[PDB]
Design a protein around this ligand. Structure first.
Ligand SMILES: CC(CO)(CO)NC(=O)Nc1ccccc1
Ligand SMILES: CC(CO)(CO)NC(=O)Nc1ccccc1
Ligand SMILES: [Zn+2]
Length: 140
C-alpha cells in the first residue's frame, strides 16, 4: 500500500485505486499501473524532475529502506500478476531488490523528491512506476 500527495492530486497504483479515486479520477493508464485522483486538502510531496538513476525505496515486506540503482523508465515485459495479465508495462524502472505484491505503493525517492512507486516484483527485482514525466502534477 501507499500513495504520493502533491498539490491536490493523490497518485496510487491503478490496481489499488478506491471507489473515491475512480469517483474523483484525473488520469489513469493501465499500461503504467498509475491512477491520479483529486483531493480536498493539499499535499507536501515534491515530484522529482531529474534523470537520477540512484535513490531509496521503502520495502514494507522487509520494513526496510534500501538504496538502489534503477534503469531509466522503459517499456518492459511483466509476467502476469493477480491484478494484471502478462503484458508490456510502460514507464517502468527496474532495480535489484526485494518486492512482493503488498510492496506496491512503496515510494522511491532521490534528492529532487518522489521518483516513483513500487509496481512490479519477482526474481529479486523491484519495478517502480515513474511519475517524473507527469510535469502537470506540479501545477493547477
Ligand atoms: C514512512 C513509510 C514507512 O517507512 C510509510 O509508511 N515510508 C517511507 O518512509 N518511505 C520512504 C521511501 C524512500 C525514502 C524515504 C522514505
Ligand atoms: C542518492 C540519491 C541522491 O539524490 C539519488 O540521487 N538519493 C537521495 O538523495 N535519496 C533521498 C531519499 C529521501 C530523502 C532524501 C534523499
Ligand atoms: Zn533526482
Amino acid at each position: 500500500s501507499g500513495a504520493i500527495y502533491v498539490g491536490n492530486y493523490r497518485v496510487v497504483n491503478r490496481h489499488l485505486a478506491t471507489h473515491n479515486d475512480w469517483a474523483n479520477l484525473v488520469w489513469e493508464d493501465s499500461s503504467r499501473d498509475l491512477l491520479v485522483s483529486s483531493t480536498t486538502a493539499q499535499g507536501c510531496d515534491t515530484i522529482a524532475r531529474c534523470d537520477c538513476q540512484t535513490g531509496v525505496y521503502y520495502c514494507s515486506s522487509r520494513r526496510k529502506h534500501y538504496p538502489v540503482s534503477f534503469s531509466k523508465p522503459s517499456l518492459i515485459f511483466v509476467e502476469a500478476s493477480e491484478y494484471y495479465p502478462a503484458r508490456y508495462q510502460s514507464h517502468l524502472m527496474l532495480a535489484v531488490g526485494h518486492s512482493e505484491p503488498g510492496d506496491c505503493g512503496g515510494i522511491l525517492r532521490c534528492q529532487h523528491g518522489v521518483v516513483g512507486i513500487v509496481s512490479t516484483g519477482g526474481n529479486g527485482l523491484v519495478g517502480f512506476a515513474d511519475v517524473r514525466d507527469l510535469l502537470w502534477l506540479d501545477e493547477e
